Amino acid sequence: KNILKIRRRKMNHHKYRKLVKRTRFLRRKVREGRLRQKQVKFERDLKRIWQKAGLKEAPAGWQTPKIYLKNQ
Amino acid sequence: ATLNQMHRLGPPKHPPGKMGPTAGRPQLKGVVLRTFIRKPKKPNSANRKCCRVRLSTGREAVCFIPGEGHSLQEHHVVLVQGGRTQDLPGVKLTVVRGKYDCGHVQKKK
RNA sequence: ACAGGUUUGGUCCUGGCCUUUCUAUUAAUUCUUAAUAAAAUUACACAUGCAAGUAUCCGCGCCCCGGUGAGAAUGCCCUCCAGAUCUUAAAGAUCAAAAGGAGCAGGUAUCAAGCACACCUAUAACGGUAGCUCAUAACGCCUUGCUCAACCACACCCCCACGGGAAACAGCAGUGAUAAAAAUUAAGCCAUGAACGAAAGUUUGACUAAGUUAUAUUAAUUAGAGUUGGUAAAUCUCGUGCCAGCCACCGCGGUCAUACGAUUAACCCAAAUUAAUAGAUCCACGGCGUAAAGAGUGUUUAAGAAAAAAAAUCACAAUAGAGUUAAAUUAUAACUAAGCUGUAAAAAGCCCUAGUUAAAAUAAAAUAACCCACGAAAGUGACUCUAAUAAUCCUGACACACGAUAGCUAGGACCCAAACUGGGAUUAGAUACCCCACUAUGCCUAGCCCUAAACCCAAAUAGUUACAUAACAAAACUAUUCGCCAGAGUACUACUCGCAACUGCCUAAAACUCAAAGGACUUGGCGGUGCUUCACAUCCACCUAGAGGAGCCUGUUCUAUAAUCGAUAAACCCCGAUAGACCUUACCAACCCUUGCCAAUUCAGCCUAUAUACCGCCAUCUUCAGCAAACCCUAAAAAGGAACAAUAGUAAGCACAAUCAUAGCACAUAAAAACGUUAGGUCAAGGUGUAGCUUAUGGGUUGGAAAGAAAUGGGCUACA
RNA sequence: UUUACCAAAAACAUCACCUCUAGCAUUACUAGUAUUAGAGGCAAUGCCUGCCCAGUGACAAGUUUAACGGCCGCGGUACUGACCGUGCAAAGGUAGCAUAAUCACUUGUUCUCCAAAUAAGGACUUGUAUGAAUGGCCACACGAGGGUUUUACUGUCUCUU
Ligand SMILES: [Mg+2]
Ligand SMILES: [Mg+2]
Ligand SMILES: [Mg+2]
Ligand SMILES: [Mg+2]
Ligand SMILES: [Mg+2]
Ligand SMILES: [Mg+2]
Ligand SMILES: [Mg+2]
Ligand SMILES: [Mg+2]
Ligand SMILES: [Mg+2]
Ligand SMILES: [Mg+2]
Ligand SMILES: [Mg+2]
Ligand SMILES: [Mg+2]
Ligand SMILES: [Mg+2]
Ligand SMILES: [Mg+2]
Ligand SMILES: [Mg+2]
Ligand SMILES: [Mg+2]
Ligand SMILES: [Mg+2]
Ligand SMILES: [Mg+2]
Ligand SMILES: [Mg+2]
Ligand SMILES: [Mg+2]
Ligand SMILES: [Mg+2]
Ligand SMILES: [Mg+2]
Ligand SMILES: [Mg+2]
Ligand SMILES: [Mg+2]
Ligand SMILES: [Mg+2]
Ligand SMILES: [Mg+2]
Ligand SMILES: [Mg+2]
Ligand SMILES: [Mg+2]
Ligand SMILES: [Mg+2]
Ligand SMILES: [Mg+2]
Ligand SMILES: [Mg+2]
Ligand SMILES: [Mg+2]
Ligand SMILES: [Mg+2]
Ligand SMILES: [Mg+2]
Ligand SMILES: [Mg+2]
Ligand SMILES: [Mg+2]
Ligand SMILES: [Mg+2]
Ligand SMILES: [Mg+2]
Ligand SMILES: [Mg+2]
Ligand SMILES: [Mg+2]
Ligand SMILES: [Mg+2]
Ligand SMILES: [Mg+2]
Ligand SMILES: [Mg+2]
Ligand SMILES: [Mg+2]
Ligand SMILES: [Mg+2]
Ligand SMILES: [Mg+2]
Ligand SMILES: [Mg+2]
Ligand SMILES: [Mg+2]
Ligand SMILES: [Mg+2]
Ligand SMILES: [Mg+2]
Ligand SMILES: [Mg+2]
Ligand SMILES: [Mg+2]
Ligand SMILES: [Mg+2]
Ligand SMILES: [Mg+2]
Ligand SMILES: [Mg+2]
Ligand SMILES: [Mg+2]
Ligand SMILES: [Mg+2]
Ligand SMILES: [Mg+2]
Ligand SMILES: [Mg+2]
Ligand SMILES: [Mg+2]
Ligand SMILES: [Mg+2]
Ligand SMILES: [Mg+2]
Ligand SMILES: [Mg+2]
Ligand SMILES: [Mg+2]
Ligand SMILES: [Mg+2]
Ligand SMILES: [Mg+2]
Ligand SMILES: [Mg+2]
Ligand SMILES: [Mg+2]
Ligand SMILES: [Mg+2]
Ligand SMILES: [Mg+2]
Ligand SMILES: [Mg+2]
Ligand SMILES: [Mg+2]
Ligand SMILES: [Mg+2]
Ligand SMILES: [Mg+2]
Ligand SMILES: [Mg+2]
Ligand SMILES: [Mg+2]
Ligand SMILES: [Mg+2]
Ligand SMILES: [Mg+2]
Ligand SMILES: [Mg+2]
Ligand SMILES: [Mg+2]
Ligand SMILES: [Mg+2]
Ligand SMILES: [Mg+2]
Ligand SMILES: [Mg+2]
Ligand SMILES: [Mg+2]
Ligand SMILES: [Mg+2]
Ligand SMILES: [Mg+2]
Ligand SMILES: [Mg+2]
Ligand SMILES: [Mg+2]
Ligand SMILES: [Mg+2]
Ligand SMILES: [Mg+2]
Ligand SMILES: [Mg+2]
Ligand SMILES: [Mg+2]
Ligand SMILES: [Mg+2]
Ligand SMILES: [Mg+2]
Ligand SMILES: [Mg+2]
Ligand SMILES: [Mg+2]
Ligand SMILES: [Mg+2]
Ligand SMILES: [Mg+2]
Ligand SMILES: [Mg+2]
Ligand SMILES: [Mg+2]
Ligand SMILES: [Mg+2]
Ligand SMILES: [Mg+2]
Ligand SMILES: [Mg+2]
Ligand SMILES: [Mg+2]
Ligand SMILES: [Mg+2]
Ligand SMILES: [Mg+2]
Ligand SMILES: [Mg+2]
Ligand SMILES: [Mg+2]
Ligand SMILES: [Mg+2]
Ligand SMILES: [Mg+2]
Ligand SMILES: [Mg+2]
Ligand SMILES: [Mg+2]
Ligand SMILES: [Mg+2]
Ligand SMILES: [Mg+2]
Ligand SMILES: [Mg+2]
Ligand SMILES: [Mg+2]
Ligand SMILES: [Mg+2]
Ligand SMILES: [Mg+2]
Ligand SMILES: [Mg+2]
Ligand SMILES: [Mg+2]
Ligand SMILES: [Mg+2]
Ligand SMILES: [Mg+2]
């Protein structure tokens, strides 16, 4: 009955898991590459703030922490 | 829903149109690439004469030739229209017959 | 919308898609004239002509009219008016830049934070506070002229033009390139408006009058286009034979097509008619158990809503600690036995094994419970104690704290269970079901992960049983809310943001494809579902005689031949044949004959194709009890319709039954056996529908066939 | 840290992770006592670390691979082979990664870079001789390591004075 809607999901979920195993490490590469764009666009968002606010350099005591690349 | 809710989301609007294969234009120019033939969907069967064209929008597409018999070669220009074929998957474009290098399907009298 | 078609064997329900109306472009087919209106691909490049002049100098004018929609979420509305200009005996008046806000104003939250975006000082450019905006949408991104007696904006590009590229028709004509997009390089200032003028008047590609165009109305002079399965107005004969083609949706074509091409008749528009693309129109003041939709739980902020009642208690199992152990299991000893464990049945396995007697640790909590408490949900039912169940009690988020199992990290635990893996079987294979081990893992402490069919698929808080049955199920509703749902897939997906996750969670699309996807229901059919009762040559058990091996008879099937056909699962196979040496005879090989059997016939004759066109005869379910008109019922009806202390059914008809036949009975056999099923068999019994053959697919003579390497069904005769 | 005097590295060490060995007293270890102390392994972090006890050791017949060490054929099938047959093994090489500092073929194929590249980077990839603590895979920072590009610079060079 309604099972036939649900059964679809089941297959459609299962066939996903399989994919996510085979494509797994490829997915890690792309993901970490995507955080490597992330942190950078964060950076530009701040540099644009100094260079709009007129200061050449970053304000005193600014290391600009990496949040997106955080691990452990 | 409730009134407040209908206020927060306002009145329903009807969604702007999704354009067809012709992208809003009633017809289009095209340049043939290769004439070939395709097989219909299930409950019925034939083999239809079909074509590939480039359009003034630069895009390449599959279009169909209505009628029996034709003279169609590469680089020949045609006028195409937005008629959708029911027989075939995803063939939404049709060559208008009687203009350019496609003359009317020839009378047998 | 007065709606219509379209999901299914069928009926409702939900639900998209499509048709019927009106408008604009372009195209294909056609087009007689005039009149009125409107003329438009292209902020791409622009040959030639012209669009600003007037006037006694000076001066006044010279994107004003006119063009375009490039740009900008631009802006509509509504205050308040500087300055320009007109009038004039100094204040009236026409535009109205800029500055402003009651209110309204394109999409997108997968753009959620912007990043100095505020204020106090009147001190006179220095100081002083720490603000401002924003989930009632700030800040973005995408696309866009307009709300139309007009309004907004641009004027070669760099938003702005000092400067730079560079050398400007988005004035009227016209021209390249480009695009589905095609007006005259035309005439005058005669009317109006404008610019100057004292004034006649001068100029004006604004404009007026033409010229070009079926682009729309009017009118006649003018007839051509589409359609004819259904929705939806209207059809005949051929041709083609799942081919060539056709359709907006359903769909049409497989040899008899009203859907195709072409006729014939008709229908409906009409100087137009169809096709294609956009509009106008079109959701939800509907809904959320089963159909898409009530988030896993609770509280609060914002923001709302409100008569009176609205704190009483466990019939005792919230949660967190600290301690405790009843039955079982097991270490490990002591006796005894050689087996023990395990399945439908066996192997493997263990014999450091089993039984009995002893015994802690860990784990898990019989019975009470046929109870219905507690907790917000997840959850909670061995024992005792300590701590302890928010709120004078409406709703409430993305904020705040929780959240079963499984999972991750570190440290312990390990009787038992167990993914996994390894053996053993089961099997075509068995990565499983069945057995044997044994691990992560269930257990404790700390920290995560934040998902469930987290479901009672039924939101919270007041109410009522009044109206009322789509269907089922947990009967039907108001009121205040908050959350959610715009066909089906694609999709517990791709991108985004956030998160102690980095095969995760959360939030969540589109290209593409389809005309459906779905909820409930009805009748069958089926079920290696359960239950009852049966099978009487009938399934098992049981009785008798055979087949399959052999020889031979005969029928198929293959091979062999110039050389029939048909049957071919039960329901073909000593079959049509209760009968082929010629004949029968359809067959092949040659030869011959063309009103060629008849009263007559541009007519005869055709064992030519169709048994899926049929009549006739039959097979079969089946020695099955039903099948069918006439009615009548059922808060609708697809359909169903019985109960004998009977609840809606009555019914002639036809089966079965009853009688006939087996020379009397009784029995048995024989016959009988409806309706339908298997497009079952046969156009070769014959007869015919449709198509074919007609000096031949017809009619005669003569001769020729039917051979076995096998393979097999059935028989007969045996093996004594 | 290393070859004083031809090698400073990609060798070694190292935080970390992991095995083994140890229940204890006056000279080491240690005036310590298993979170300790010795014999080694591999190199932090992050994700991981698959199957194999037959051989050889090692331990206590039996048990061990983060011990030494291993991790397959031969045919048939819709060019390939998910599927099938059969043999042999203790298991039959997984996750990754890949023309590599990886026998040969070899200047593998293609894309980018350059006017032209046996270079360099990206892919593809049976490497039948990759591959998982004789560690496999990414990644930060680091390097007088080893390669390639660009800027700038120059007597390196045209071509010397
Ligand atoms: Mg699927
Ligand atoms: Mg990505
Ligand atoms: Mg069409
Ligand atoms: Mg359906
Ligand atoms: Mg149907
Ligand atoms: Mg059905
Ligand atoms: Mg449709
Ligand atoms: Mg036209
Ligand atoms: Mg036009
Ligand atoms: Mg221009
Ligand atoms: Mg204007
Ligand atoms: Mg305009
Ligand atoms: Mg906005
Ligand atoms: Mg104003
Ligand atoms: Mg998105
Ligand atoms: Mg914009
Ligand atoms: Mg625009
Ligand atoms: Mg400009
Ligand atoms: Mg200038
Ligand atoms: Mg012009
Ligand atoms: Mg101009
Ligand atoms: Mg032109
Ligand atoms: Mg003129
Ligand atoms: Mg005119
Ligand atoms: Mg017209
Ligand atoms: Mg007209
Ligand atoms: Mg005419
Ligand atoms: Mg009709
Ligand atoms: Mg054919
Ligand atoms: Mg016919
Ligand atoms: Mg039709
Ligand atoms: Mg027709
Ligand atoms: Mg409505
Ligand atoms: Mg309901
Ligand atoms: Mg949807
Ligand atoms: Mg709920
Ligand atoms: Mg909630
Ligand atoms: Mg959920
Ligand atoms: Mg109230
Ligand atoms: Mg505790
Ligand atoms: Mg015991
Ligand atoms: Mg048993
Ligand atoms: Mg045994
Ligand atoms: Mg109980
Ligand atoms: Mg209970
Ligand atoms: Mg208390
Ligand atoms: Mg309470
Ligand atoms: Mg409450
Ligand atoms: Mg509340
Ligand atoms: Mg949890
Ligand atoms: Mg756990
Ligand atoms: Mg653990
Ligand atoms: Mg264990
Ligand atoms: Mg123990
Ligand atoms: Mg056990
Ligand atoms: Mg096994
Ligand atoms: Mg089997
Ligand atoms: Mg079974
Ligand atoms: Mg165990
Ligand atoms: Mg637990
Ligand atoms: Mg539950
Ligand atoms: Mg449930
Ligand atoms: Mg529950
Ligand atoms: Mg739910
Ligand atoms: Mg649901
Ligand atoms: Mg609620
Ligand atoms: Mg009521
Ligand atoms: Mg009913
Ligand atoms: Mg969708
Ligand atoms: Mg899930
Ligand atoms: Mg996801
Ligand atoms: Mg979020
Ligand atoms: Mg029998
Ligand atoms: Mg029987
Ligand atoms: Mg016999
Ligand atoms: Mg025999
Ligand atoms: Mg033969
Ligand atoms: Mg025969
Ligand atoms: Mg036959
Ligand atoms: Mg049959
Ligand atoms: Mg038969
Ligand atoms: Mg017989
Ligand atoms: Mg004969
Ligand atoms: Mg004949
Ligand atoms: Mg046939
Ligand atoms: Mg028949
Ligand atoms: Mg037949
Ligand atoms: Mg019949
Ligand atoms: Mg009866
Ligand atoms: Mg009847
Ligand atoms: Mg009836
Ligand atoms: Mg009698
Ligand atoms: Mg009788
Ligand atoms: Mg009988
Ligand atoms: Mg009878
Ligand atoms: Mg009978
Ligand atoms: Mg038949
Ligand atoms: Mg006949
Ligand atoms: Mg006939
Ligand atoms: Mg003859
Ligand atoms: Mg003869
Ligand atoms: Mg035989
Ligand atoms: Mg006999
Ligand atoms: Mg006999
Ligand atoms: Mg040296
Ligand atoms: Mg030294
Ligand atoms: Mg040296
Ligand atoms: Mg490592
Ligand atoms: Mg090293
Ligand atoms: Mg050994
Ligand atoms: Mg591999
Ligand atoms: Mg790779
Ligand atoms: Mg090599
Ligand atoms: Mg190797
Ligand atoms: Mg290993
Ligand atoms: Mg090793
Ligand atoms: Mg080494
Ligand atoms: Mg190696
Ligand atoms: Mg570091
Ligand atoms: Mg370096
Ligand atoms: Mg160094
Ligand atoms: Mg160094």
Instruction: Give residue for tokens 């097989």.
Output: B39
Which residues fall within 8 angstroms of residue B103, CB to CB, at 6 or more apart?
A: B71, B97
**Which tokens is A46 given?**
């701040």
Q: Phi/psi of residue B47, each to 5°? A: -135, 120
Closest CA to B94 of B31, B45, B27, B38: B27
With beta carbons less than 8 A apart as the criterion, state whether B87 and B62 touch. Answer: no
Strand C contact with A22 (CB < 7 A) = no
Å from CA of A60 to ligand 54 middle: 62
With beta carbons less than 8 A apart as the criterion, state whether B46 and B60 touch. Answer: no
H or E segment to which residue A44 belongs: helix A24-53
CA distances from B104 to B32, B47, B100 (A): 18, 21, 10
CA–CA distance, B95 with B77 (Å, rounded to integer): 10
CA–CA distance, A26 with B21 (Å, rounded to integer): 35
Å from CA of A71 to ligand 9 middle: 66
DSSP β-bridge partners for residue B77: B31
Q: How many CA atoms lie within 13 A of B1 on its CB side?
A: 10
Whole-number distance in Å between B25 CA and C356 C1': 99
**Which tokens is A67 given?**
């949040």
Kindly provide the resolution of this structure in angstroms, with one decimal. Answer: 3.8
**Orientation angle between helical segments A3-22 and A24-53, nearest 10 degrees:** 80
DSSP β-bridge partners for residue A44: none
With beta carbons less than 8 A apart as the criterion, state whether B66 and B97 touch. Answer: yes
H or E segment to which residue A11 belongs: helix A3-22
H or E segment to which residue B80 belongs: strand B77-81
Strand C contact with A9 (CB < 7 A) = yes
CA–CA distance, A33 with A16 (Å, rounded to integer): 22
Strand C contact with B71 (CB < 7 A) = no
CA–CA distance, B16 with B90 (Å, rounded to integer): 23
Q: How many CA atoms lie within 13 A of A22 on its CB side?
A: 5
Closest CA to B34 of B65, B74, B94: B74
DSSP for B35-51 reads -EEE---SSS---EEEE
Whole-number distance in Å between B10 CA and C104 C1': 14
Neighbours of B51 (CB within 10 A): 26
H or E segment to which residue B8 belongs: helix B3-8
B13 closest-nt by C1' vs CA? C283
Å from CA of B102 to ligand 113 middle: 61
CA–CA distance, A65 with A55 (Å, rounded to integer): 20
| Structural determination approach | cryo-EM
